[PDB]
Design an enzyme around this catalytic site. Structure first.
Site, PDB file in Angstrom:
ATOM      1  N   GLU A  24       0.669  -1.345  -0.016  1.00  0.00           N
ATOM      2  CA  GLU A  24      -0.024   0.130  -0.061  1.00  0.00           C
ATOM      3  C   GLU A  24       1.065   1.174   0.049  1.00  0.00           C
ATOM      4  O   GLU A  24       0.589   2.115  -0.884  1.00  0.00           O
ATOM      5  CB  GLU A  24      -0.859   0.046   1.135  1.00  0.00           C
ATOM      6  CG  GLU A  24      -2.195   0.660   0.898  1.00  0.00           C
ATOM      7  CD  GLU A  24      -3.181  -0.073   1.702  1.00  0.00           C
ATOM      8  OE1 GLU A  24      -3.415  -0.003   3.050  1.00  0.00           O
ATOM      9  OE2 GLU A  24      -4.453  -0.657   1.184  1.00  0.00           O
ATOM     10  N   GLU A  82       3.769  18.725  40.888  1.00  0.00           N
ATOM     11  CA  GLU A  82       2.820  19.634  41.240  1.00  0.00           C
ATOM     12  C   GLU A  82       2.960  21.177  41.193  1.00  0.00           C
ATOM     13  O   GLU A  82       2.182  21.923  41.020  1.00  0.00           O
ATOM     14  CB  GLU A  82       2.673  19.289  42.848  1.00  0.00           C
ATOM     15  CG  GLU A  82       2.478  17.759  43.122  1.00  0.00           C
ATOM     16  CD  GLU A  82       2.516  17.675  44.596  1.00  0.00           C
ATOM     17  OE1 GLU A  82       3.363  18.015  45.666  1.00  0.00           O
ATOM     18  OE2 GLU A  82       1.217  17.007  45.087  1.00  0.00           O
TER      19      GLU A  82
HETATM   20  N1  LIG Z   1       9.102  30.440  54.439  1.00  0.00           N
HETATM   21  C1  LIG Z   1       8.305  29.627  54.992  1.00  0.00           C
HETATM   22  N2  LIG Z   1       8.458  29.863  56.538  1.00  0.00           N
HETATM   23  C2  LIG Z   1       7.838  29.138  57.244  1.00  0.00           C
HETATM   24  N3  LIG Z   1       6.951  27.988  56.719  1.00  0.00           N
HETATM   25  C3  LIG Z   1       6.883  27.668  55.429  1.00  0.00           C
HETATM   26  C4  LIG Z   1       7.769  28.452  54.326  1.00  0.00           C
HETATM   27  N4  LIG Z   1       7.425  28.078  53.240  1.00  0.00           N
HETATM   28  C5  LIG Z   1       6.655  27.002  53.316  1.00  0.00           C
HETATM   29  N5  LIG Z   1       6.404  26.836  54.657  1.00  0.00           N
HETATM   30  C6  LIG Z   1       5.611  25.694  55.347  1.00  0.00           C
HETATM   31  O1  LIG Z   1       5.759  24.440  54.440  1.00  0.00           O
HETATM   32  C7  LIG Z   1       4.524  24.297  53.646  1.00  0.00           C
HETATM   33  C8  LIG Z   1       4.908  23.907  52.214  1.00  0.00           C
HETATM   34  O2  LIG Z   1       4.549  22.567  51.991  1.00  0.00           O
HETATM   35  P1  LIG Z   1       5.830  21.907  50.998  1.00  0.00           P
HETATM   36  O3  LIG Z   1       6.191  22.737  49.972  1.00  0.00           O
HETATM   37  O4  LIG Z   1       7.062  21.798  51.916  1.00  0.00           O
HETATM   38  O5  LIG Z   1       5.229  20.463  50.640  1.00  0.00           O
HETATM   39  P2  LIG Z   1       4.153  19.541  51.263  1.00  0.00           P
HETATM   40  O6  LIG Z   1       3.611  20.101  52.440  1.00  0.00           O
HETATM   41  O7  LIG Z   1       5.020  18.330  51.497  1.00  0.00           O
HETATM   42  O8  LIG Z   1       3.331  19.030  49.943  1.00  0.00           O
HETATM   43  P3  LIG Z   1       2.407  20.260  49.293  1.00  0.00           P
HETATM   44  O9  LIG Z   1       3.103  21.382  49.222  1.00  0.00           O
HETATM   45  O10 LIG Z   1       1.875  19.500  47.922  1.00  0.00           O
HETATM   46  O11 LIG Z   1       1.228  20.515  50.195  1.00  0.00           O
HETATM   47  C9  LIG Z   1       3.544  25.316  54.295  1.00  0.00           C
HETATM   48  O12 LIG Z   1       2.253  24.786  54.185  1.00  0.00           O
HETATM   49  C10 LIG Z   1       3.884  26.083  55.287  1.00  0.00           C
HETATM   50  O13 LIG Z   1       3.422  25.477  56.335  1.00  0.00           O
END
Ligand SMILES: Nc1ncnc2c1ncn2[C@@H]1O[C@H](COP(=O)(O)OP(=O)(O)OP(=O)(O)O)[C@@H](O)[C@H]1O
Ligand SMILES: Nc1ncnc2c1ncn2[C@@H]1O[C@H](COP(=O)(O)OP(=O)(O)OP(=O)(O)O)[C@@H](O)[C@H]1O
Ligand SMILES: Nc1ncnc2c1ncn2[C@@H]1O[C@H](COP(=O)(O)OP(=O)(O)OP(=O)(O)O)[C@@H](O)[C@H]1O
Ligand SMILES: Nc1ncnc2c1ncn2[C@@H]1O[C@H](COP(=O)(O)OP(=O)(O)OP(=O)(O)O)[C@@H](O)[C@H]1O
Ligand SMILES: Nc1ncnc2c1ncn2[C@@H]1O[C@H](COP(=O)(O)OP(=O)(O)OP(=O)(O)O)[C@@H](O)[C@H]1O
Ligand SMILES: [Mg+2]
Ligand SMILES: [Mg+2]
Ligand SMILES: [Mg+2]
Ligand SMILES: [Mg+2]
Ligand SMILES: [Mg+2]
Ligand SMILES: [Mg+2]
EC number: 2.7.11.1
Lengths: 491, 74, 62, 506
Positions: free
Chosen positions: A64, A305
């Site tokens: 073909e 994510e």
């Molecule tokens: N600058 C920062 N100071 C204090 N706490 C922080 C700061 N950045 C992030 N966090 C904390 O860490 C969390 C962010 O989640 P992270 O990125 O560590 O991943 P995870 O909790 O495992 O998964 P997901 O982000 O999908 O929820 C926030 O919800 C918060 O409580």
């Protein structure tokens, strides 16, 4: 020749792992499937590989597609067919019909062809032959019984000749008959079905060896991939349980954590950090991926994510500079939606990217983001593939699991990947005095001793600061503790 | 054999002949039939079944990407 | 004879249990299945074992 | 009997019940089904029985099988059709085509055949007639409309002749059309359908009567098995609820229990012993089977979890020697994997064994073993069976059930058989002070009074010991109680200092 069956290797990555050597020599193999499954591609990749790897010239018989086109296309995998024809190493035996003609020419030509073919074989000292869509021939006006005899004539002639063939066939239903006239099935020595399974608006090519007369092989469907480097199959079952295992240790990015696991993460191991959304897995990963840079080692981070830019943000907010890591070419980030593919295509992007950066560490942020929509089994099959490849390759692995229920969770992982891993670091929310306080814990470490305490832990611009346990609480695991404040012994 | 241009009834009488003669001879035979659906008829033409005195079915059930071989004495 | 049927042992590991003795003597047995189920094998193995265990030659029509 | 149609008895076990008497006389019953479904047995056995019990000579017409073969095969069950053909009580009429044939002959042969059959019946004075696989006849080159007409003819001549015929037929799909051409269903007076449902690798045969033009009958599929005795049907729905009930008592093998049971089990009762794995239901049964033998009665034990060998090791470690029990010809142990057959089969093996031994006591260890994989509606229907049989036979029963979750079981049985059983004896674990302790409870007795106490019991080499209840405990059923004390130290035998002796002397 009074020995077992002899197989010729296709070199089609993985096909030979399943066909325990490959297509049996001197015989014809049937590879049918529906429109768009790779059949053609397969046959080509069959011949080509044969030429470029054993100088076994090949005959390609198309009923073909036109020669100019069979070539034009092949350039899609970086293959200059034209050259192999100039070098008399590949002969494209055009058998297609022209825009004009007559009829009542049934088997009249099935006898000439077998003569034009034996011609090119002898003449080019051919060893491999691939007949494309032999079906489109009796698609002139024939019935089952008529087809059975014509095929048998062909194959037979070809088995007399002594050429190893592969015949292309078209199907209409993915799980119905093997070939358009449920007849080929029994006219062939070996049968390979190429499937393009729908199921969810997502497709999934799978290849299967139904039978190999005289030899053994592997049973069932195997996922494969059509890329720029042709058909790539992954015998996720073929993989053996013979991975290297050493006592060497590695830093977690968190000193206190390394302490908890009693000396660190074994270089040869899989690490699983499970926590309800928000407990800071993505943190541990970031930290675990920075430590493999201060030690000038290469590391890849597969986030499913968050975006490239966002990761950079949240990263710089915990201290660690990912900008640098990029320049210094010690850290490479990927990022892709789980919806931008299937677990087959993904596993390959991973493996593939590993080979070009030769990582010493790898972190997949959100395994469960990858289990979005796909079946359970299919998923496990995905973890075993990444988990494995990483194992036998000496690459320390840290994957992220986000359970579906903050607080209360009665199982590490919802998909049950528990047993598939070496060390389990479990983060969890704890409700103290009306506040959502975190806690970390080394659930299970296979080699090491690791600490058994459930330790409180906060997060700041400095990163994870692990604290003390909740020694004076009850039911921590449940999430909603209960302080004991025991009246000592009461004197 | 009847994949030359036959239809059920012509296939039925024909088996019946074969089997029958072979019964006379006193031969303990084993006949092989090809199918098209793991759980559809027992044999290509839907005739063979009844014709034979004993029937055996070998299946290669798919299901979940894995195939499982089973043998049934009908 | 003048009793129930008599069977021939196949020595096909197990099958001679699932049939309570084996194929009935002096009769045909239809063994069918889709491509790859193992019919041709089963037919061979029946013959072979015949010879190899009771010196009962066989005929193989193909 | 109130039925406008006079029926004839097949004598096949239970078909008559299903057909409310058997086939209608002077009519024809289409018995159809796929391959290996029982067609030919039914037909054969239908003639046979009319010969051995009513001296009703019969004519058997075969279109495919050979006259030599129908006899040869028929011995499988233990019938000598040969002899009958010898006494002229059974004429076999051969209509199979030849191994060296031609093509074309199915209309004037249908006329010739009718004229043939009329003869045999006239000559043998037959009252029963079978016609095996008429289907195969038009299987020469025909279509729907030609069959209907050719059937009709045969059936009609048969009814004029006054014969009570039976025609067998093939089908392709177990649940699709009734017959092949889909016309046999409407030219027959009655239609009996045989199935051999696959479903989950096993195979279940059922018999269904779709229609009897003229009378009532039992609607729906009914299980049946082919054995060394022919077909055998179980009217699991025809089994009336009119079993005998007495007030007599029988020991449980364990005294304390008996007390707890108002005075020993009822002779006429179904006994249910539930509890987590390891609670000792097995033990109890062993004692219950034993005791019948200690009193000189017969009792069978059907074990679906333990080997006949192990059943003895453990039985001895608990005292009671089962070896002798087998010898004195009082106890009979069975043993059978539930996966080694379907429910229809197991049900019969049990019944049979219940006949060849006339037990007075029966104990099926682990009904929840038989529940493995089966559909609840199929299991519940099994339970009802064995249970029923045992009730209408004055044979005490002790059934066992193991709960899928130890401690925390919010239900007596996961199959909700609860209401089928008459008495329930419960067993469970109690996390009392870092320790798993057994507790026994008599949940319900239909006719008695029974103690309402959750006594603790310990298992020993001697066996079961029934102590007392954890009065000072809340959340007992929780498995892991809580201990509240309004007392404990309270009397019972306080008086401190040196209350004991030691091994030397007291
Ligand atoms: N600058 C920062 N100071 C204090 N706490 C922080 C700061 N950045 C992030 N966090 C904390 O860490 C969390 C962010 O989640 P992270 O990125 O560590 O991943 P995870 O909790 O495992 O998964 P997901 O982000 O999908 O929820 C926030 O919800 C918060 O409580
Ligand atoms: N460079 C490439 N990269 C990724 N995918 C490709 C590339 N080239 C081709 N493909 C894919 O592979 C398929 C080609 O299949 P091919 O034409 O070889 O044979 P077939 O589908 O088996 O039979 P048919 O002749 O009916 O198409 C396409 O459907 C396409 O999705
Ligand atoms: N040595 C072997 N070890 C393991 N498996 C084998 C071996 N040889 C053959 N097989 C398996 O048995 C199959 C061969 O099929 P076989 O020749 O027995 O007859 P069949 O499929 O029923 O008939 P047909 O293949 O002729 O259509 C192969 O498809 C393969 O999966
Ligand atoms: N003694 C026996 N004990 C248990 N089962 C038996 C015995 N004899 C025969 N069988 C079973 O009974 C079945 C015989 O079916 P039968 O000859 O009655 O008619 P059929 O299968 O309905 O139709 P056909 O004659 O076309 O096969 C077989 O499937 C076989 O397994
Ligand atoms: N000689 C013995 N001495 C003390 N305890 C025993 C003795 N034999 C058995 N046991 C106890 O009884 C249990 C055995 O259970 P048993 O055989 O009574 O049936 P079950 O628990 O009801 O059901 P299953 O055995 O199927 O789990 C053991 O787990 C153990 O605690
Ligand atoms: Mg193609
Ligand atoms: Mg085949
Ligand atoms: Mg074959
Ligand atoms: Mg049949
Ligand atoms: Mg029959
Ligand atoms: Mg037990």
């Amino acid at each position: 020749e009074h020995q077992a069956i002899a197989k010729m290797r296709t070199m089609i990555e993985g096909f030979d792992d399943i066909s325990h050597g490959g297509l049996p020599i001197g015989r014809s193999t049937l590879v049918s499937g529906t429109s768009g499954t790779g059949k053609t591609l397969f046959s080509i990749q069959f011949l080509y590989n044969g030429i470029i790897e054993f100088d076994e010239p090949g005959v390609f018989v198309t009923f073909e597609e036109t020669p100019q086109d069979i070539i034009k296309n092949a350039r899609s995998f970086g293959w200059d067919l034209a050259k192999l024809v100039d070098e008399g190493k590949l002969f494209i035996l055009d058998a297609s019909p022209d825009p004009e003609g007559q009829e009542v020419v049934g088997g009249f030509d099935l006898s000439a062809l077998i003569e034009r073919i034996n011609y090119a074989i002898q003449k080019y000292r051919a060893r491999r032959v691939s007949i494309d869509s032999v079906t489109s021939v009796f698609q002139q006006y024939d019935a089952s019984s008529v087809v059975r005899r014509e095929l048998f004539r062909l194959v037979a002639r070809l088995k007399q000749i002594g050429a190893t063939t592969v015949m292309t066939t078209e199907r209409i239903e993915e799980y119905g008959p093997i070939a358009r006239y449920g007849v080929e099935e029994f006219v062939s020595d070996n049968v390979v079905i190429l499937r393009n399974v729908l199921e969810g608006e997502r497709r999934r090519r799978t290849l299967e060896i139904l039978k190999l007369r005289g030899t053994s092989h592997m049973k069932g469907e195997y996922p494969f991939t059509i890329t720029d480097h042709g058909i790539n199959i992954f015998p996720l079952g073929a993989m053996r349980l013979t991975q290297r295992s050493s006592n060497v240790r590695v830093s977690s990015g968190v000193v206190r954590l390394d302490e908890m696991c009693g000396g660190g993460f074994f270089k040869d191991s899989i690490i699983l950090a499970t926590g309800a959304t928000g407990t800071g897995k993505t943190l541990l990963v970031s930290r675990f991926v920075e430590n493999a840079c201060a030690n000038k080692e290469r590391a890849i981070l597969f986030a499913y994510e968050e975006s490239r830019a966002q990761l950079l943000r949240n990263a710089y907010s915990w201290g660690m500079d990912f900008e640098e890591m990029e320049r210094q070419n010690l850290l490479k980030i990927v990022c892709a939606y789980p919806e931008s593919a299937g677990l087959e295509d993904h596993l390959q992007i991973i493996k593939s990217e590993i080979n070009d950066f030769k990582p010493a560490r790898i972190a997949i942020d959100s395994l469960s983001a990858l289990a979005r929509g796909v079946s359970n089994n299919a998923f496990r099959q995905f973890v075993i593939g990444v988990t494995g490849y990483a194992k036998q390759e000496e690459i320390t692995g840290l994957f992220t699991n986000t359970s579906d229920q903050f607080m209360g969770a009665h199982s590490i992982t919802d998909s049950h990947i528990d047993t598939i891993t070496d060390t389990i670091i479990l983060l969890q929310y704890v409700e103290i005095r009306g506040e959502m306080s975190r806690a970390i814990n080394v659930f299970k470490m296979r080699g090491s001793w690791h600490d058994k305490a459930i330790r409180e832990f906060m997060i700041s611009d400095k990163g994870p600061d692990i604290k003390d346990s909740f020694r004076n609480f009850e039911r921590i695991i449940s999430g909603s503790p209960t302080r004991i404040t025991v009246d000592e012994k009461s004197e």
